[PDB]
Amino acid sequence: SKPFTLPILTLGELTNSRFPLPIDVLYTNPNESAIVQCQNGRCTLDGELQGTTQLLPTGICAFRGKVTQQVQDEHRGTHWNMTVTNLNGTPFDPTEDVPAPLGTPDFSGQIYGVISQRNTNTNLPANRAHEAVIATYSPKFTPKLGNIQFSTWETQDVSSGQPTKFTPVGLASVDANSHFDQWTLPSYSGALTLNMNLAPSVAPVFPGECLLFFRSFIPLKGGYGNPAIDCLMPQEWVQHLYQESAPSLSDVALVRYVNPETGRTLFEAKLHRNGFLTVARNSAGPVVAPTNGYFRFDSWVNQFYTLAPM
Amino acid sequence: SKPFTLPILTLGELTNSRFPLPIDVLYTNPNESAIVQCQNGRCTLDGELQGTTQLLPTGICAFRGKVTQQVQDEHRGTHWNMTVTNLNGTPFDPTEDVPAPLGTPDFSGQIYGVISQRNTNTVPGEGNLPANRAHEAVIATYSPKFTPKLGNIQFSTWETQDVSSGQPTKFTPVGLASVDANSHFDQWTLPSYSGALTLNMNLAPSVAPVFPGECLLFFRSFIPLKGGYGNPAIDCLMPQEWVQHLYQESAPSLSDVALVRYVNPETGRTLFEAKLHRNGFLTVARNSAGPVVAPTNGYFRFDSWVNQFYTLAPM
Ligand SMILES: C[C@@H]1O[C@@H](O[C@H]2[C@H](O[C@H]3[C@H](O)[C@@H](O)[C@@H](O)O[C@@H]3CO)O[C@H](CO)[C@H](O)[C@@H]2O)[C@@H](O)[C@H](O)[C@@H]1O
Ligand SMILES: C[C@@H]1O[C@@H](O[C@H]2[C@H](O[C@H]3[C@H](O)[C@@H](O)[C@@H](O)O[C@@H]3CO)O[C@H](CO)[C@H](O)[C@@H]2O)[C@@H](O)[C@H](O)[C@@H]1O
Numbered sequence: 213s214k215p216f217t218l219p220i221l222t223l224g225e226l227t228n229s230r231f232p233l234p235i236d237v238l239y240t241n242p243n244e245s246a247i248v249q250c251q252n253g254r255c256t257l258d259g260e261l262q263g264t265t266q267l268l269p270t271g272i273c274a275f276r277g278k279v280t281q282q283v284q285d286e287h288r289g290t291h292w293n294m295t296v297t298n299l300n301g302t303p304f305d306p307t308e309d310v311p312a313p314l315g316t317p318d319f320s321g322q323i324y325g326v327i328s329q330r331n332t333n334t335n336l337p338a339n340r341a342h343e344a345v346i347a348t349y350s351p352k353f354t355p356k357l358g359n360i361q362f363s364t365w366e367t368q369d370v371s372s373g374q375p376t377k378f379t380p381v382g383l384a385s386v387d388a389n390s391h392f393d394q395w396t397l398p399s400y401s402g403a404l405t406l407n408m409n410l411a412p413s414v415a416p417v418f419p420g421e422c423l424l425f426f427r428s429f430i431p432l433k434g435g436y437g438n439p440a441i442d443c444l445m446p447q448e449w450v451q452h453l454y455q456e457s458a459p460s461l462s463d464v465a466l467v468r469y470v471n472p473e474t475g476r477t478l479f480e481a482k483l484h485r486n487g488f489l490t491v492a493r494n495s496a497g498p499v500v501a502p503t504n505g506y507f508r509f510d511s512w513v514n515q516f517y518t519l520a521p522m
Numbered sequence: 523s524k525p526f527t528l529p530i531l532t533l534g535e536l537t538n539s540r541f542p543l544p545i546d547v548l549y550t551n552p553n554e555s556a557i558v559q560c561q562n563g564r565c566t567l568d569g570e571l572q573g574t575t576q577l578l579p580t581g582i583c584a585f586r587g588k589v590t591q592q593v594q595d596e597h598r599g600t601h602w603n604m605t606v607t608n609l610n611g612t613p614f615d616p617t618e619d620v621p622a623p624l625g626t627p628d629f630s631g632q633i634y635g636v637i638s639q640r641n642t643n644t645v646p647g648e649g650n651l652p653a654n655r656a657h658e659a660v661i662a663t664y665s666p667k668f669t670p671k672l673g674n675i676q677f678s679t680w681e682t683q684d685v686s687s688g689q690p691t692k693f694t695p696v697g698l699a700s701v702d703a704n705s706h707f708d709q710w711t712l713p714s715y716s717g718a719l720t721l722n723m724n725l726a727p728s729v730a731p732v733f734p735g736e737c738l739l740f741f742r743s744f745i746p747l748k749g750g751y752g753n754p755a756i757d758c759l760m761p762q763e764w765v766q767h768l769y770q771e772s773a774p775s776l777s778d779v780a781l782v783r784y785v786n787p788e789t790g791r792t793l794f795e796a797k798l799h800r801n802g803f804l805t806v807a808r809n810s811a812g813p814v815v816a817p818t819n820g821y822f823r824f825d826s827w828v829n830q831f832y833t834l835a836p837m
């Protein structure tokens with residue numbers, strides 16, 4: 213039976229699985245009232261990708277497809293409808309058992325990035341790129357139906373019928389009108405439809421335990437704020453688990469966060485079969501620990517194992 | 523000790539180590555006249571990172587630092603100086619034995635992206651939160667003001683005023699501004715990391731085939747353009763996932779060359795074989811330039827270490 217392992221990457225060698233950002237800090241928030249059910253960065257410990265999770269760091273919150281035409285919308289700016297394909301360019305099949313094309317954003321907000329186009333016709337093709345926003349809460353955000361809408365400040369220089377890429381950069385705003393909520397899923401098929409094929413929600417099941425996240429701070433195009441995106445496992449863990457596909461020998465792996473410059477354990481955590489961490493902590497905020505620390509798998513344990521308090 | 527391995531990732535599950543892009547195609551160009559000496563995506567088969575290579579996909583062609591002031595420049599646009607730190611926020615020590623801060627671009631061109639800032643000072647009237655701004659920006663890596671090894675670079679914006687001095691600044695790369703004649707895109711020309719007239723140091727070595735009939739094999743990605751005509755590409759010697767894997771495993775190299783097979787897992791047939799050299803690059807026996815037309819679910823599998831007499835089957 214192939215032994216389970218994690219990569220040996222310090223926090224400073226890890227990236228977020230929910231937006232293309234480095235991991236900045238570990239984080240807890242035991243008083244969170246929302247259901248935690250993100251769809252990117254979801255992988256079981258035996259290597260089964262779930263939700264909208266895919267392997268490419270460049271695929272997270274990215275889209276590929278083609279602009280169809282300019283459209284009108286109450287949002288400020290100039291608006292464009294885009295069909296979306298799979299990230300690899302093949303047509304997205306809405307009958308596949310996924311919530312939306314892999315890589316689709318898994319949160320409500322105004323995602324800021326760059327739309328770029330390289331024309332099919334040429335002898336070299338013409339190109340353009342412009343800043344763009346995708347409001348994932350909009351009724352026109354229908355990636356599971358194969359099309360979305362983005363806005364630009366640019367008033368006309370977006371071509372219809374030409375290959376189009378969205379490169380995410382950050383958020384447009386976090387003011388009240390921009391509806392940023394990292395735990396609110398988009399409605400992938402539109403306003404009044406039920407999302408399907410979701411990766412399950414995650415939660416601690418033992419008193420005294422809370423979720424532990426890998427937190428990244430996300431850029432803003434304007435306004436005030438210090439927004440963050442919390443993932444359950446970094447993208448390199450998704451990639452590693454997918455590769456190894458080690459059988460899970462219990463429902464809970466005990467892992468130790470170790471300072472290698474001393475071999476000392478700073479704290480311990482439970483890494484659950486569905487791909488998330490809990491710790492024994494009764495406070496919210498960052499975990500203050502050196503970023504050369506890393507998680508080391510020590511043994512499979514019973515669900516009723518009591519974690520040493522942080 | 524540890525057997526050598528490569529990850530099991532198809533072409534469509536790989537990303538470029540020299541720019542944040544998926545791998546699009548395998549590619550050869552036997553007649554290339556330039557010295558191939560890129561500095562990102564450089565890792566020996568026993569896991570030694572070289573050049574300016576680091577592990578984060580988000581770090582490739584990224585910068586972190588602080589805008590110091592607006593500056594004068596003869597070229598069109600508004601120009602800004604920024605100091606750069608290490609990507610982890612610690613001060614860059616110019617005496618370290620690297621060519622430049624890890625992640626620094628390794629080619630000549632106008633790199634297009636977004637500069638974003640999150641202020642250090644917070645506003646009580648805004649909930650004790652900082653002000654933010656982001657704008658499109660271009661970094662001309664051939665400019666005499668591109669001096670990352672000295673701890674600072676210059677970028678240009680279309681925006682004429684709304685970039686703040688003294689505030690934390692991030693550059694997120696997106697593509698190239700142009701590949702017209704005046705934009706000096708050449709993927710094999712290194713920047714002068716310490717400026718005009720200085721010699722670059724601590725470089726990862728150049729790579730080349732040493733056997734007749736062999737040419738380098740690259741993992742090629744097409745890079746976006748802000749404007750103009752072109753279909754520019756960036757070729758890396760190994761994808762970022764291979765850098766990450768080799769660094770983790772640190773498997774001893776048992777010869778100078780690992781024979782690898784590009785396999786189609788559906789049929790289990792080998793499509794071609796290649797030499798994976800100790801310093802971290804591939805060669806194939808091919809006498810043409812252009813893409814390697816193969817399924818994107820194919821992948822390289824380590825076969826065995828080979829000696830200096832092994833001749834590759836032609837593609
Ligand atoms: C705080 C400043 O933000 C930018 O100011 C621009 C301003 O941004 C607003 C956002 O667009 C809006 O969603 C909300 O978040 O409030 C922001 C202002 O607080 O938008 C106007 C146009 O309406 C201008 O573009 C302002 O420049 C940034 O540009 C400033 O430097 C400040 O950081
Ligand atoms: C940072 C420099 O930017 C350009 O020169 C600008 C010049 O910078 C001066 C600094 O302000 C000063 O602290 C000291 O370092 O001398 C610098 C060079 O004179 O400031 C003027 C102000 O009008 C212009 O903005 C210059 O463009 C660049 O040319 C230099 O090489 C430095 O990188």
Ligand SMILES: C[C@@H]1O[C@@H](O[C@H]2[C@H](O[C@H]3[C@H](O)[C@@H](O)[C@@H](O)O[C@@H]3CO)O[C@H](CO)[C@H](O)[C@@H]2O)[C@@H](O)[C@H](O)[C@@H]1O
Nearest residue numbers: 338339340341369370699700701702705748749750751
């Ligand atoms: C081919 C068209 O490119 C863009 O046109 C914009 C134009 O881009 C020029 C680049 O700035 C220049 O480096 C060189 O590459 O030529 C390009 C034009 O071919 O720049 C002007 C401003 O000077 C306008 O912004 C043009 O719109 C693109 O916007 C067009 O849709 C075409 O693809």
